[PDB]
Design an enzyme around this catalytic site. Structure first.
Site, mmCIF file in Angstrom:
data_model
loop_
_atom_site.group_PDB
_atom_site.id
_atom_site.type_symbol
_atom_site.label_atom_id
_atom_site.label_comp_id
_atom_site.label_asym_id
_atom_site.label_seq_id
_atom_site.Cartn_x
_atom_site.Cartn_y
_atom_site.Cartn_z
ATOM 1 N N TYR A 133 -9.314 59.005 87.665
ATOM 2 C CA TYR A 133 -9.782 60.016 88.603
ATOM 3 C C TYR A 133 -8.925 61.269 88.462
ATOM 4 C CZ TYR A 133 -9.987 62.282 93.231
ATOM 5 O OH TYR A 133 -10.054 63.192 94.263
ATOM 6 N N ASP B 40 -17.728 68.484 71.776
ATOM 7 C CA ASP B 40 -18.335 68.907 73.032
ATOM 8 C C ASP B 40 -17.270 69.390 74.017
ATOM 9 O OD1 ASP B 40 -20.204 69.408 74.956
ATOM 10 O OD2 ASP B 40 -20.695 67.316 75.379
ATOM 11 N N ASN C 190 -16.132 69.777 80.904
ATOM 12 C CA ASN C 190 -15.605 68.498 80.443
ATOM 13 C C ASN C 190 -14.084 68.493 80.379
ATOM 14 O OD1 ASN C 190 -18.202 67.419 80.125
ATOM 15 N ND2 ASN C 190 -18.383 68.271 78.056
#
Ligand SMILES: Nc1ncnc2c1ncn2[C@@H]1O[C@H](COP(=O)(O)OP(=O)(O)CP(=O)(O)O)[C@@H](O)[C@H]1O
Ligand SMILES: [Mg+2]
Length: 259
Positions: free
Chosen positions: A85, A129, A134
């Protein structure tokens, strides 16, 4: 490993294939992120196998600037990824709030990216990517590379904003893709826009293949030098991550050491 072992909290994000939720394992109270992918959608496209490869790649990666994958399981219809997390959200949201980053924050983030990418290249791993949405932020504001759904090995073969010419041209790419994206991000951090943005996919495509972009006046010469060296049409002309980590503009402005 079943879903009954986690308490599910608010969603951290939503996507085409599934959703990410804050979660806590019941036995240990370990808080983490649970990414729930639906097999049906992953099958509608040819993505279920790219997911398998991404999971296998990420589980073997251990780096303070790479989001950990603790494990994974699945049920009848859904695939579950047990993720570290990252409590301070995405660099994308940080960019919206601040409009743009200063040279110190940009150099720090690029240094952390180049460190993590050096660890990946030192294990034959490309990401491809690398978008702001991200890149996640840890408790101490450190960058963490996430979303490994596009990572692959060896050369191999959405918005194009972060893809290099050899990819949009459909050619064979290599570890230099990550160098191009690094230069796109460095630009976006300082300017607030990726350098090849456009209203149209077809126009963005032209700009990338031509490497047609311009700097605002406030971009310093050191930033222009670094960005111009990264955004080379010819992959072999792009520098190595070692050359980036030792670039003068990086060393002068980065608050974190290199690797
Ligand atoms: N460990 C994590 N901690 C905090 N937020 C996270 C997180 N993982 C993902 N998120 C948030 O959810 C969003 C989407 O997650 P992620 O990028 O990993 O999946 P994805 O890009 O493949 C969506 P899609 O399934 O449509 O392709 C992220 O941009 C981020 O805001
Ligand atoms: Mg993503």
């Amino acid at each position: 490993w079943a879903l009954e072992d986690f308490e599910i909290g608010r969603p951290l994000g939503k996507g085409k294939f599934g959703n990410v939720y804050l979660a806590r394992e019941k036995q240990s109270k370990f808080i983490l992120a649970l990414k729930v992918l639906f097999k049906a959608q992953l099958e509608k496209a040819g993505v279920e196998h790219q997911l398998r490869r991404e999971v296998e790649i990420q589980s073997h990666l251990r780096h303070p600037n790479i989001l950990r994958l603790y494990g994974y399981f699945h049920d009848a219809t859904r695939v579950y990824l047990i993720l570290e997390y990252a409590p301070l959200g995405t660099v994308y949201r940080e960019l919206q709030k601040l409009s743009k980053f200063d040279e110190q924050r940009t150099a720090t983030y690029i240094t952390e990216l180049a460190n993590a990418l050096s660890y990946c290249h030192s294990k034959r791993v490309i990401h491809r990517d690398i978008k702001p949405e991200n890149l996640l932020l840890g408790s101490a504001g450190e960058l963490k590379i996430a979303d490994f759904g596009w990572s692959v090995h060896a050369p191999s073969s959405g918005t194009l904003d972060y893809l290099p010419p050899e990819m949009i041209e459909g050619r064979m790419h290599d570890e230099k893709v990550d160098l191009w994206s690094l230069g796109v991000l460095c630009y976006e951090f300082l300017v607030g826009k990726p350098p090849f943005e456009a209203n149209t996919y077809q126009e963005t495509y032209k700009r990338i293949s031509r490497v047609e972009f311009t700097f605002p006046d406030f971009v310093t010469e050191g930033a222009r030098d670094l960005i111009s060296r990264l955004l080379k049409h010819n992959p072999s002309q792009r520098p190595m991550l070692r050359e980036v980590l030792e670039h003068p503009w990086i060393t002068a402005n980065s608050s974190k050491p290199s690797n």
